[PDB]
Symmetry: C2
Subunit: 485 residues, 2 copies
């Protein structure tokens, strides 16, 4: 039908105008914009999708090819580089690295672009150079490049690439050892023979695992978990990054896998940029699991990420949309713990303390409104945000009145039927109130508790026996008697 | 010569176990058969100081002293003996005998008033007694009638008028007797009182017959009767029903608690309640609770200190059958000793008495109770806890509370989340965060029943106030433990 593309593009653009988080809508919109030839609009649509989602290697590769096969300038070259730089972040991508290398080969002649090629291949190798099946292509392409240059019969570059590859367990390395012997008229030194042979021993070691992947269907999660384990016991940080990544490209929706990888980096070789990177990638691949946002905020805090960045990240976390109210309480509590750990409490007043209190009010209102309106629940039925606030105010801020207010609020939402709650507040008054307030609290407790009144009773008697007048003890015995009768 | 040796034997068995009641009645039996008058009398004295004597034993002693009384000094001493006799239980016969014997003193010693004293007091005790008081009214009017002088008769008239205003058995018979006796007309005012008395007598009939139809001790019947009289709420009549119930049921400790409490909460009289408490620990000295109640009474009514101390010592020397009971009474005494301390001075005589009493209690439990029970008595170091709570909160002394908690935690109390948290909360209140962290770390390591709860508390504490580092170490400990 005539002009159907125009109308369907309008339709999809409007459907995205309401629900921006529609992946298939972006994919469709982009293919139709390509068929109509609206090039700049394809570029924009692609940019918005890539800023919302991780793109697979095929989508990244399509966009890269379109920008490359359309580039007529040196500035276009720098912009293409920028696009590659953005493309490598999402997942492990051997082909993207290959294309980046070869496309960068065009950059020679321009002064600073021999090193540019070597940088691209070097980072390519550092990333996937160990890849059992796809690294070989990168080693080979890098060597083809150095061979096509090899100025003045200076084969130290090609030699080095051979010697670095041969010490590494990838497929058909025997073939590379072959081409090397037939190439280097000099002997292949015993360091290279020894390392080559232990490497071949690493191929034979790993064969059953790789063939487990080959046979398996779908995303092959089980096989990746077995390989993850095996490599994690063998304990090479490089090789466990590699298998975590290889498993993650195929299993990137599995949050617990992100947590395993995240946790290994986060706790064991905590290099800032790498863990912050992997956390960000986790919250882009599985934004529905608040745990990922929590560990990410904890990671940022641990690594001294600037204040404003953490705040903005929290805002993204709020907006991610979780399926349980306990999750909104959870992320709010994470943010508030961060805010509290920001305050010095030994000064009359603070800028940071006021931000903490303000964030508490905001958190409570947000649970009153957004979470209730979307769930018909409070998220914390037992007012834990308020509890933590009262604790802070009483124990750290000398502000006992606010704590009393907050516990008023806590008890009014039906928490007064619970002995545990009464004892939580009592312990607060005992900690930072006075004996009068503890008495009031425990009396009220004796007359409100529904689950375990005898427990509050015995605490009351204990308190008066320890500290109250004989009149006080007598009143206590009467209340408890009348209550438990 | 078997009597000689059997007496010697009983004296030996009393030399070992002085709290053998039947041994005393037997010893006295034999000493009487032997004519050892002096030894009979102080066998009677020692027994009467150990136990309450029933009405009959008191009557034997009284009859013997009376039929052996040969001068006026014996008369006054017999009076003293009666004075001691009435204290133990309710004793209508003894009150009657006390009156009749007091009649012998009329001529001499200005003691015509004495007879009226004895009979008035006899009335105050059992004058309201539904079945046995009539005997006492009758005897009182007999004496007054026989010493009527010039027919003034206002003593006999008044006595009749007082009996008729009270519901006693077959007063209808005395109402008639009075009319026949009275030259004048029974007044309008006593007539209404007699008729109201008829009302309440017919009211009480099914309860009195409840006692009669039932076999003794009619505890239930007595408990039901006590219930009714207490619902009517007359203090005289419910004291009376409590005493009548107790004479047959003096071994029922819960009954002494009921009566003791009724007076404690409601009557609000020192002499009455303290009497009932003393009599309670004499009848059932084996229920530590009675001693507790009693000490509390003494504290309430401002009883002098040394009396309270001595009563406590008696309490310790009583024999209880449970390790927990010695903790209970020690706690009673220690709470008492604490309520004597003005905690707003740096040091005190009363505070040092408290502390020294604490050391005494811990040592006494480590020694007497452990060696006699093969137990700690206090398994959960309750006395030690209370000492810690006091030292921390009421004195400025936090160090001692920490020590006391070493001792508390070292006998297997370290497996328990409650204990760990008790120490924690104490440390939270009067220690510092450092010690709370230390405490809760060790708590997650040691707790066996509810380690997850302790883990919660740790995480909550570090979230509320600890560094990020502290939060991470906490999560590590927790996860490692609950793994």
């Amino acid at each position: 039908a005539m002009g159907s593309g125009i109308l369907e593009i309008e339709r999809l653009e409007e459907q995205l105008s309401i629900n921006v988080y529609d992946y298939n809508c972006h994919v469709d919109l982009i293919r139709l914009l390509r068929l109509e030839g609206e090039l700049t609009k394809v570029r924009m649509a692609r940019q918005k999708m890539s800023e919302i989602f991780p793109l697979t290697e095929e989508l990244w590769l399509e966009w890269l090819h379109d920008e490359i096969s359309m580039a007529q300038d040196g500035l276009d070259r720098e912009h293409v580089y920028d696009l590659f730089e953005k493309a490598v972040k999402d997942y492990i991508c051997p082909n993207i690295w290959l294309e980046y290398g070869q496309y960068s080969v065009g950059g020679i002649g321009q002064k600073g672009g021999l090193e540019k090629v070597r940088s691209v291949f070097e980072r390519a190798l550092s990333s996937v150079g160990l890849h059992m099946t796809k690294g070989l292509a990168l080693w080979e392409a890098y060597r083809e490049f150095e061979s096509a240059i090899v100025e003045a019969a200076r084969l130290e570059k090609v030699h080095s690439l051979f010697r670095r590859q041969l010490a590494i367990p990838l497929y058909d390395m025997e073939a590379t050892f072959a081409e090397y012997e037939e190439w280097s008229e000099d002997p292949i030194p015993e360091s290279v023979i020894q390392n080559y042979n232990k490497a071949l021993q690493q191929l034979e070691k790993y064969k059953p695992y790789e063939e487990a992947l080959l046979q398996a269907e779908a995303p092959r999660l089980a096989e990746y978990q077995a390989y993850i384990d095996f490599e994690m016991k063998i304990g090479d940080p490089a090789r466990i990054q590699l298998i975590f990544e290889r498993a993650l490209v195929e299993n990137c929706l599995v949050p617990d896998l992100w947590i395993r990888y995240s946790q290994y980096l986060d706790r064991q070789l905590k290099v800032k940029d790498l863990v912050l990177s992997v956390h960000n990638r986790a919250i882009r691949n599985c934004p529905w699991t608040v745990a990922l946002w929590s560990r990410y905020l904890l990671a940022m805090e641990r690594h001294g990420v600037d204040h404003q960045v953490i705040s903005v990240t929290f805002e993204k976390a709020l907006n991610a949309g979780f399926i349980q109210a306990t999750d909104y309480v959870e992320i709010w509590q994470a943010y508030l713990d961060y805010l509290r750990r920001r305050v010095d409490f030994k000064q009359d007043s603070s800028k940071e303390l006021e931000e903490l209190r303000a964030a508490f009010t905001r958190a409570l209102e947000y649970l009153k409104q957004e979470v209730e309106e979307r769930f018909n629940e409070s998220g914390d039925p037992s007012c834990v945000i308020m509890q933590n606030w009262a604790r802070i105010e009483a124990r750290l801020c000398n502000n006992m009145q606010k704590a009393r207010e907050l516990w008023d609020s806590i008890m009014t939402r039906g928490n007064a039927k619970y002995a545990n709650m009464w004892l939580e507040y009592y312990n607060l008054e005992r900690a930072h109130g006075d004996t009068q307030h503890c008495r009031k609290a425990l009396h009220r407790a004796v007359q409100c508790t529904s689950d375990y009144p005898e427990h509050v009773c015995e605490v009351l008697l204990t308190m008066e026996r320890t500290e109250g007048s004989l009149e006080d003890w007598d009143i206590a015995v009467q209340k408890t008697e009348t209550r438990l009768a």
